[PDB]
Amino acid sequence: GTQERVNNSNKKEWNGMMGELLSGQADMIVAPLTINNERAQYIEFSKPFKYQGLTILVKKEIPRSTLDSFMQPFQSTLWLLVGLSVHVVAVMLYLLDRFSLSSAMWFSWGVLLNSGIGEGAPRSFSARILGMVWAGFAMIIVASYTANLAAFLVLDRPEERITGINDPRLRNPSDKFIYATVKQSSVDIYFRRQVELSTMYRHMEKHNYESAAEAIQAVRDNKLHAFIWDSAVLEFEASQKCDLVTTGELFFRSGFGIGMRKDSPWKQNVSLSILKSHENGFMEDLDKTWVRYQECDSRSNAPATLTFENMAGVFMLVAGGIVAGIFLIFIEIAYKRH
Amino acid sequence: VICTGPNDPRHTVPQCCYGFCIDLLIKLARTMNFTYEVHLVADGKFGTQERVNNSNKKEWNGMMGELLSGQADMIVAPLTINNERAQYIEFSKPFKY
Amino acid sequence: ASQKCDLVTTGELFFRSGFGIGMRKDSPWKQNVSLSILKSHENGFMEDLDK
Amino acid sequence: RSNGTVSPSAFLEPFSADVWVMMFVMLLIVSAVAVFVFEYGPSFTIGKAIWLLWGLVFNNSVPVQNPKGTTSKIMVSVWAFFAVIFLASYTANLAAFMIQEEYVDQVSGLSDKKFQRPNDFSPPFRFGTVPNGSTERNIRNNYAEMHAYMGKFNQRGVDDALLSLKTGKLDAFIYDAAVLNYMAGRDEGCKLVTIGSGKVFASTGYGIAIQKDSGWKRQVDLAILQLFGDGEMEEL
Amino acid sequence: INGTWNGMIGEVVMKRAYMAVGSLTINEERSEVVDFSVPFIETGISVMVSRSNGTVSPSAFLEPFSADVWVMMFVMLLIVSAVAVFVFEYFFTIGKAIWLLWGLVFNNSVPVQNPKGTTSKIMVSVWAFFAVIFLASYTANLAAFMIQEEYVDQVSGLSDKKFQRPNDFSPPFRFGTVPNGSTERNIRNNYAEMHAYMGKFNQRGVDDALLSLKTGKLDAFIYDAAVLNYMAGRDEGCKLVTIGSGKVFASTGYGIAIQKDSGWKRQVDLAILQLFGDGEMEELEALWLTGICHNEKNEVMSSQLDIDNMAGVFYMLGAAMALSLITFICEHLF
Ligand SMILES: O=C(O)[C@H]1CN(CCCP(=O)(O)O)CCN1
Numbered sequence A: 001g002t003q004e005r006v007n008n009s010n011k012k013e014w015n016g017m018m019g020e021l022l023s024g025q026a027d028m029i030v031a032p033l034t035i036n037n038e039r040a041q042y043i044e045f046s047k048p049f050k051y052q053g054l055t056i057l058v059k060k061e062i063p064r065s066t067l068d069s070f071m072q073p074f075q076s077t078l079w080l081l082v083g084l085s086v087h088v089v090a091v092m093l094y095l096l097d098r099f100s101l102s103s104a105m106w107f108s109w110g111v112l113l114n115s116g117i118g119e120g121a122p123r124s125f126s127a128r129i130l131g132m133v134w135a136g137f138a139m140i141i142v143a144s145y146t147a148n149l150a151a152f153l154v155l156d157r158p159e160e161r162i163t164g165i166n167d168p169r170l171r172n173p174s175d176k177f178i179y180a181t182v183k184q185s186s187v188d189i190y191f192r193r194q195v196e197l198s199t200m201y202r203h204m205e206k207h208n209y210e211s212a213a214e215a216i217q218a219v220r221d222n223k224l225h226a227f228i229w230d231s232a233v234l235e236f237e238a239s240q241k242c243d244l245v246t247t248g249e250l251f252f253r254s255g256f257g258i259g260m261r262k263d264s265p266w267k268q269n270v271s272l273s274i275l276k277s278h279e280n281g282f283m284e285d286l287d288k289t290w291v292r293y294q295e296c297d298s299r300s301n302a303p304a305t306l307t308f309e310n311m312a313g314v315f316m317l318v319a320g321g322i323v324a325g326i327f328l329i330f331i332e333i334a335y336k337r338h
Numbered sequence B: 001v002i003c004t005g006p007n008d009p010r011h012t013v014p015q016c017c018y019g020f021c022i023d024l025l026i027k028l029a030r031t032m033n034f035t036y037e038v039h040l041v042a043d044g045k046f047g048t049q050e051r052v053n054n055s056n057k058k059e060w061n062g063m064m065g066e067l068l069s070g071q072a073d074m075i076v077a078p079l080t081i082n083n084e085r086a087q088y089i090e091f092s093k094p095f096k097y
Numbered sequence C: 001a002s003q004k005c006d007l008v009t010t011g012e013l014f015f016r017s018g019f020g021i022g023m024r025k026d027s028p029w030k031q032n033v034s035l036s037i038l039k040s041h042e043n044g045f046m047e048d049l050d051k
Numbered sequence D: 001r002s003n004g005t006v007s008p009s010a011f012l013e014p015f016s017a018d019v020w021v022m023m024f025v026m027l028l029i030v031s032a033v034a035v036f037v038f039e040y041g042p043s044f045t046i047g048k049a050i051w052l053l054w055g056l057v058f059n060n061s062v063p064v065q066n067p068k069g070t071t072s073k074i075m076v077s078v079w080a081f082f083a084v085i086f087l088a089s090y091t092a093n094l095a096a097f098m099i100q101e102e103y104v105d106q107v108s109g110l111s112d113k114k115f116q117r118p119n120d121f122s123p124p125f126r127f128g129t130v131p132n133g134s135t136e137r138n139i140r141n142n143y144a145e146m147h148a149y150m151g152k153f154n155q156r157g158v159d160d161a162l163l164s165l166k167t168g169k170l171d172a173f174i175y176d177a178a179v180l181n182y183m184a185g186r187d188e189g190c191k192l193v194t195i196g197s198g199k200v201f202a203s204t205g206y207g208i209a210i211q212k213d214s215g216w217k218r219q220v221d222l223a224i225l226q227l228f229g230d231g232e233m234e235e236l
Numbered sequence E: 001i002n003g004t005w006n007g008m009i010g011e012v013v014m015k016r017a018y019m020a021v022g023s024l025t026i027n028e029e030r031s032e033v034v035d036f037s038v039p040f041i042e043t044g045i046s047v048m049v050s051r052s053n054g055t056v057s058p059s060a061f062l063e064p065f066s067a068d069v070w071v072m073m074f075v076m077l078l079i080v081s082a083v084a085v086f087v088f089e090y091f092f093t094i095g096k097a098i099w100l101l102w103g104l105v106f107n108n109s110v111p112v113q114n115p116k117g118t119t120s121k122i123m124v125s126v127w128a129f130f131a132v133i134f135l136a137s138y139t140a141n142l143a144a145f146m147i148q149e150e151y152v153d154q155v156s157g158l159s160d161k162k163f164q165r166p167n168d169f170s171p172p173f174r175f176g177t178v179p180n181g182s183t184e185r186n187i188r189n190n191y192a193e194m195h196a197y198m199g200k201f202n203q204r205g206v207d208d209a210l211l212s213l214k215t216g217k218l219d220a221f222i223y224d225a226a227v228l229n230y231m232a233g234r235d236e237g238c239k240l241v242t243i244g245s246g247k248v249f250a251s252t253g254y255g256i257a258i259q260k261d262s263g264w265k266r267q268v269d270l271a272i273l274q275l276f277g278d279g280e281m282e283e284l285e286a287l288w289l290t291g292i293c294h295n296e297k298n299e300v301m302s303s304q305l306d307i308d309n310m311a312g313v314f315y316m317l318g319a320a321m322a323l324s325l326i327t328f329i330c331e332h333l334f
């Protein structure tokens, strides 16, 4: 229900449930109907039977790991520098040993990484100090790589979701956020009547849907970004389907009531019945039977797990090394025979 | 510039004072011909409106009180411009926002 | 907070105002003083004083 | 409010099961390839190579005997590089997994076994309320077992109930929603929390009492509705 | 122009209007025909720049442990090695023990020769546990230090070496402003060399200057403080940054133009001062003069490592190589 011009005459009239009740086609409105000033000037509302507010729906996309390859922490320049430095150190160690071979290269490789095959240690004092410094440098490099990877993983979190109605992303509409509505309800009236909300109302006017179900379905897909329908319905939808969540806090407190005409001999009796039902516990039973039950709860966003993205690169390199070894075994055997 | 005012003995020992306000005052004096005689506020407070133990009579204190009484002709100091003080004295264009 | 190394001015600015020269009402100096202040601001004397 | 610890299985969180199985298959394939390549006192065996690879994977702590082959050394070096990368990634992921926040039990509210069947549970839930009030009469009229159970937890005084809850002498305090919210908004720290507004039993509101048939009722109701619609209610 | 005025000032002077409410700047020449009330907003000449990542730390690798801790660890290692060698002798040289301890500290990256005995084995185990603890602590502290924030260039309000003599820097500073305006005239009147240098950059239009700054073809944009502040908060992100309000040049404000002798000047001044004191000015500024990124805080970024980041470690390796060469040359004689 909402007051609008007929586009044909200068007389404005209600539409929907409010119009039907005023037109005399119905004597009561038993359905979710928020109590507001605009609709209270024409009909009579009984005492609320369900207190609620306004919330926002969110898709809550599952987190994913941004890491792509094991070379992310170090640029190719650093890899080349270390590759050349290991050879330089091996050559220097070999020269020092000779003056005062593959053994030096094996030792350098086994000290840099943890191969454990670089047997043979230098005996000269200078060679000993060089080996100690090389081991320290390798340890520092490994520690720095691990620390950088840990820092990157810790600081890898999904973008923050909307928090309430005061979020700057909502106050400044763009071409990405939608946050549509039903296009004819208490929400539309509330957003139109607001003084410092013209931008939001103008942005939502071009994307409002026709029913709550369509808006929820669009939100479940990638066509809609947010929904501001209500709280008693959004919470139930989130509980039933944990694919969506409710964000923010209620910003328009109201309640559902029974709509009736101004001159109706049922207002007092209906209000007393509602109060008695609230007091005795009938409303609690109804809520437990129809609302107070869920299927899947919610879980605070936890750190992501390394998927096959981590495998990509590392196992590719392992396979490449195996292929290179299989290709070079024949060449090595031929060279040994020759 | 010579700078006469109290210390801590209520004697008015003349010290010497300088700084941003002194430089601005010197520049203003150079621009418009007029001599000056700087002195410190005896109370030592910027100024506010307070009551008295006697009957309720409005009165200022500090630099504002000294200027209103007539012991001074101009105030050269970090004095903020507000509605309360603007109803009695006149402020120039701000020299520091 | 620039010559202590242990004090920090944390927060945003509120109640923005400015420093002015106070005089008595009906004084033959307000207009000239304000003009001098504006001229100093435009020329750059205030920048030199601040530096 | 509680704190929350780390899950017992968190040590397996960093890597998915598929990653572990792929790593095991790759290790087996590498060991077989090395054994085959070794053909071209300490006789080499497939089991010895598998043991060496397994030991060198984690931290090559266990003693092993390196192969005498040429390409075997290159294979071992590549495996060691892969193992170091894997260990660094696992440590980083485990460090990232240790950041955990607080949580709330999220009680349904006067509708779960906690307030209905405490005996068939851990040590019985200690929930109480201030006696001699409307809440006690409402509970007695609507429930009997809960009232009898709570009769032994009569916490006299809102401040006394809060102190008992803080010290652990009580598990839950049943009272008025507005008063509980106001107290939770001023308690030391943030230990005390209140249930969600959507799970309140016997909901009602605060209003203005007028004459039996006064004509100002409609005007007052319209003014209150206008205040609600404008948005001054949130500011207040 | 041609003696007569124009626009709002001209209309107010011509007597067809009493006040001119809007974004009117207060200046000395404009105050000789009309009277200006107390400004309700401050403005001046401001410079807009772009945010820089700034996540480099050549000495970060030494941050986890202080020099005193390192020296104490070295002395403890020497003492432990000496005690172990003495115990082994009592029941193979000192050099072998020190080499073994060094290898143990660095995750046993070298094939050291283990000693024989029981007390020596116990001491080696204790040292291994200590080394494990030390390595774990060092790695944890290094990981903690790897978190870096984003900083903003410090400019002393158009009084930096980058603005007075940009030629000194190899990548000379490129600062520009819109010509044919008050800012260009003020800069030319105040400074001569700076104006001549900036003449090469004459970007026209605020949007063009913003696009140039975002792309990188420009280093700084000099304009009005209020306009720059408004544009900063309505940018796609937080790249654009304006210097603090305390470093603006030629400070002034926006006021209300009134006739010379009107009698409303005092009333309007008092009303504006009351508005300032009560607090409605802050609410108005938040409602109107505030963007998404206006109140944004410095985010935390985790950048990777490059050659310049690894500075010091390579320098340490080079110094060690030079020391080894020097010792080899010296000991070659005896
Ligand atoms: O009914 C009222 O007039 C007051 C009294 N209420 C006290 C409720 C006491 P209990 O929780 O029922 O024991 C507080 C606000 N409403």
Ligand SMILES: O=C(O)[C@H]1CN(CCCP(=O)(O)O)CCN1
Residues within 6 Å of the ligand: E023, E024, E025, E178, E179, E180, E181, E182, E183, E184, E223, E224
């Ligand atoms: O003077 C005024 O009344 C207006 C005009 N201003 C434009 C300044 C143009 P430039 O940067 O000096 O080239 C904006 C607000 N004040």
Ligand SMILES: [Mg+2]
Residues within 6 Å of the ligand: A114, D059, D060, E107, E108, E109
């Ligand atoms: Mg090892």
